[PDB]
Design a binder for this molecule. Structure first.
Ligand SMILES: Cc1n[nH]cc1CNc1ccccc1F
Length: 168
């Protein structure tokens, strides 16, 4: 059994841990929590084989700059989630894009453009925009909702294959 190290990053108000809770025990959290660093591991059957889903959470505080670029010496799976409820988060993705690209020292890397809060009527980011950026980033776009559980597992199963594609 291999442990798939996946790191979820993004802006504040996207609800990163919300997707995790939805994927672990199948539940949508309403209350927001300022998570600094939480550990989430679960054995799931991916591609037929039992794999260990290692999900590490990150803080939304831009004050820990010396922590963001500290142990990020290694990285197998990156998760860039954005919310269509806020256009700033969509633009903030560009900052993380170059940030990670610079730290990774590479361009090609298994990634997925996932959008949360897609069921919210506060659509500030249209679908065309996401597809446009996805084409430039070179990664697929997957609309996901934690409130209605809109294909959550499908957004993970894809990334796992991408990693295996990059490796073999
Ligand atoms: C911290 C730490 N304590 N024990 C091992 C590690 C490294 N793990 C890890 C590092 C970066 C992204 C994702 C990860 F799971």
């Amino acid at each position: 059994m291999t442990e798939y190290k996946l790191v979820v990053v993004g802006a504040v108000g996207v609800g990163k841990s919300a997707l995790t809770i939805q994927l672990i025990q199948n539940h949508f959290v309403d209350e927001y929590d300022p998570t600094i660093e939480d550990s989430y591991r679960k054995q799931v059957v991916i591609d037929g084989e039992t794999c260990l889903l290692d999900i590490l959470d990150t803080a939304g505080q831009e004050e820990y700059s010396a922590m963001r670029d500290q142990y990020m010496r290694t990285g197998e799976g990156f998760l860039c989630v954005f919310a269509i409820n806020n256009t700033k988060s969509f633009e903030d993705i560009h900052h993380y894009r170059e940030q990670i690209k610079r730290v990774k020292d590479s361009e090609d890397v298994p990634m997925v453009l996932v959008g949360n809060k897609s069921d919210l009527p506060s659509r500030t980011v249209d679908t065309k925009q996401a597809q446009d950026l996805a084409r430039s980033y070179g990664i697929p776009f997957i609309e996901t909702s934690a409130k209605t559980r809109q294909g959550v597992d499908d957004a993970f199963y894809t990334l796992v294959r991408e990693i295996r594609k990059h490796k073999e």
